[PDB]
Symmetry: D4
Subunit: 181 residues, 8 copies
């Protein structure tokens, strides 16, 4: 099965077909893994607009989007607001707790869940989900564990790539509309 990023297995496509919830890591997935820090305590993070468009397409194609992140920042709240992401868990080490809460609130089986991570701290959740995704430049020890490895790096369109994959699998890609913000 061909995609606009390269061929994927029938098994990966079958997994993506069932996804009702896409959970995303922030650092190294939605960003390039950097943290910008200033002398007056300012903190910045870079997000990618094409990911934003992808998220918008998913959110309006009956695919819920969630975020579970180890750090905690107001800027992430602002980013979730502008994209319309209502499910946000910040400052969590053991991400299994947020994951159990998500499966509870949305009444959703783990087989209908996809997760995109970039480090070993993400694997406990990724192990349980229907479609585990590692970004192109994730930690070397995570890459072979995931169901699908993206072609695009974290913060460069890896999330858009996953969004495109889910929509294509469900026959929603051609008629998908979002906002490139």
């Amino acid at each position: 099965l061909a995609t606009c990023y390269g061929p994927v297995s029938a098994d990966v496509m079958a997994k993506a077909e069932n996804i009702r919830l896409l959970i995303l890591d922030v650092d190294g997935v939605l960003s390039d893994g950097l943290i910008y820090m200033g002398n007056n305590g300012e903190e910045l993070k870079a997000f990618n607009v094409r990911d934003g468009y992808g998220i918008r397409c998913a959110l309006t194609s009956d695919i819920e989007v969630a975020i579970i992140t180890g750090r905690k920042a107001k800027l992430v709240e602002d980013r979730c607001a502008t994209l319309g992401i209502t499910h946000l868990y910040q400052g969590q080490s053991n991400k299994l707790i947020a994951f159990s809460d998500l499966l509870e609130k949305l009444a959703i089986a783990p087989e209908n869940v996809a997760y995109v991570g970039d480090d070993l701290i993400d694997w406990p959740v990724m192990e349980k989900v229907g479609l585990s995704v590692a970004v192109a430049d994730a930690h070397p020890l995570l890459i072979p564990r995931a169901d699908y490895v993206t072609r695009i790096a974290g913060g460069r369109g890896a999330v858009r790539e996953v969004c495109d994959l889910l929509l294509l699998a469900q026959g929603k890609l051609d008629e998908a509309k979002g906002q490139s913000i």
Copy 2:
């Protein structure tokens, strides 16, 4: 014929000869597709100074330069001011509305218009223009659709490349002068 970025087709050269208006996307085209967000509500974007030089050369050589963007930020208005861009459309989901508004105000035919984009939301406009351009690292589904694909990535000199192309085709490249800002 020969350009400093590599050979281009005669058809692309001929399209570029009639361009009286260059419409530019912002995110992914004039920038590398990143939005910097802070904890105090700050927002940054990165612009390329060699693109600035190209835009100046275009404006000072009878080629109007316009911007249509899906995002809305004051920093964009500032950047347009410093470059002497007077045509700015922000927060536009359906870019056809703004595109139609531009052509009626400037009294210019769609064939005399070039558009440089990076995502699928730009295509409805790009389809109608004389010279459609996708940046090197545009969305993979956009690339095969455009009349021309730049060698240089978004935010790295892709706009300059397009400006160089228009000027050369119009025999203005030798005499064109600008400010590297």
Copy 3:
């Protein structure tokens, strides 16, 4: 739409749908452009096995395969014979002559012909065909002229890529065998 080598335009896919004959340049297209010459007058040329599979797929799926070369070698006859190619023109400077001979013999319109080339001498023929193809590492001046530029280089699987494209466009890719 989507291909295993990456996205292609609607216009290119429409062109590939109509192809009944694929004409192939040899040097730089079926080979990496190299000529091996020996002291006893030996001559070798390298061919790609995956191109072979693609040509066998096309030939058994209603797509005829032809060759027009500027060089002349017995080894090229041997290669065609093993692949079941019957239309071979060697030592052809002006490739337009061999081209007209093919359209006549097979009773085929130039719109239903694809040509894969790598140098400027191939252009007079590529201009006339429905689907012109330059290989990834073709001469720089030929590349922007073609309808489609391959992702794979000459002798590396560029021909297989084109066979894949024709069979995909014709809905034959799944069923085809080589």
Copy 4:
């Protein structure tokens, strides 16, 4: 776990551990996919010496090496004789005849069988084996189907790579000895 070619999944390492027979494709796997032909009818094929060493290590460390190829030439016979490969099947469209012959002769289950191929014609065999492998530069559609994809290209050491993996997983790589021929 970690290999000298990069991390592999526990799944691949566990599959490699269980392997008693290694079936190898020739063209595009043991060679770089090229057929060198001459005017007098001479034919050449190129092989990699570091692959040779790996085959000698596998054969000396209780792993069988077998070849199923669609082509037929005397040179392939000669290569196998220099390596001590006793199981060779040439000129076959359907590689399932040879694969099943190899299972009855060695009394070996499909799971203890690993296959290295580079094209779609190999897939029927690889589908049924314990560890299916595709070389780095295999046909794009074959790549996502394999359990393992080699880092090294066909004819460059993709076979050595698989031999190194088979030996590592079996704890034989430390004291494995071969001849670089």
Copy 5:
């Protein structure tokens, strides 16, 4: 000996086993060598979260992490505060003074120390330590002097690479746990 970044020498793995103190450069090691400066006198630097996870792993595994910088910035104090780095030295031109100071305070022999640098100013200290490390994109002249050259660039996970190496050498990597901060 196999790591997830590729093979390392037995001597490097032996040196890495004895490490109780890891001293790190900031600029070009924890960052990509860039200083972001503003008109109101702002200063930003970028850090890598996967480096943070590595640092947290070392500190919780009996490996002290310290920093010696030639620059002085409040932002760096903040980054150290998040990671649990208690030994910070800023504004220091001659890094030997800070180096001698650390060994005296921690009662540690130089052979039990590792240093990760990127420029020639780091060498006088690196020469003395048990394990000297130059990052992948360090100054050309520093690279051949170091015991180990990282595969990953400064600011992109070179520090995490060293942490992973130290933990594997000491048999602590499997059980090592940190926070991606």
Copy 6:
């Protein structure tokens, strides 16, 4: 002769031997050509620390460093202050004026001057100096005009590279000591 960035011509080394003044462009030479802008008028630019070390080595080794830039920002003054650069020209559209002034004030012949540029507006000055330099990623049309093309891209160490070259040509490289700032 051999340098740590690769071989250089005998003419380039002879030209570097005579250099008493190094003139640098800012944008695309000391930076990667990006301008960061915010919604509150904030302006940011990124500088490279290893460039800073080079400039420090040059200034302390009897090579004067000057800057001529077409933009104007306070942050550039802050950078020049820290590096000890006293010759700065901002908002300079025609760079030939600042060049004439520098030769006048410092009593220096153009043959003893080096200029590092990245765009075509730099050329009128570069044409007159003893050693003209284009950065690796300078505008395509400037590259073939320059006496030397750096290996390193602008804002990534292109200036450190030129600094190393001048110091090597003059036999000051080993004696050179600066601050990594």
Copy 7:
């Protein structure tokens, strides 16, 4: 000026404009620098067909082509015969001897001569000619010495590139025609 291989300097184009004779190295220039030797005393060498087309264009556009090679083989004579090269010197250790003979025979000044080489043994002749050319993958010490360094590697179209440059400079490229042999 712009070429299909990228920009070249005005000085390079001026040198190319005067060229009446192009002299070529064989090994590393017309070939990829390989010698194929066999057990029966067979010797092979690889030539590039697009180089042959370029050579045919040169000879038919009032540009004499000649070869000076340090080795001697009958295959080279055969190659020259197919291309119509009539000036061939083999087994040539001091290439200045053949160079003088050629210039005497054709009554041509050193300035009207171009030489394409790949190794240091070629420099004494290259130093004297109007246009000296080192191929992209020439010996690293030769590269900085040449007037022009080709973009394309030896045996891959470096000679075609030089032919293309001479024809363009002399205004003969559009109407130049050869045979792809």
Copy 8:
């Protein structure tokens, strides 16, 4: 000190200054690792002529060049003949035997010997010599063990690089005169 392939360590250079004997592997060192086999029992192996020039330079500069290879072919004898190599051992599985014979015959201490290899079978010999060299594309497990790793791949100029290194260290590089064969 600095070389035309990049900086080497002061240790590697000091080792290179003592080298009187250069022992070379064949397959993967003087060639790219390929064995060409034919239907009528023909064998070919490709040699690099720039390597030949380097070997000629070594042999004329008080550096003996020897060969120990695991395979056995008349073509290798022919290649040694043309280069003037008289010390050739073929079909050697345990290379320590021929190594002991060499040191015995030439009356040379192992510290004054250099070995260039590409696989693990070379290591027992490399472990004993003064300068062990692994080629750029050697087996991954060999690379970290060698004193020096070449920039150039086997059969592409790796041997030339080593020759250039020995001559440079002994002050004979500009001196060096050979035949490009």
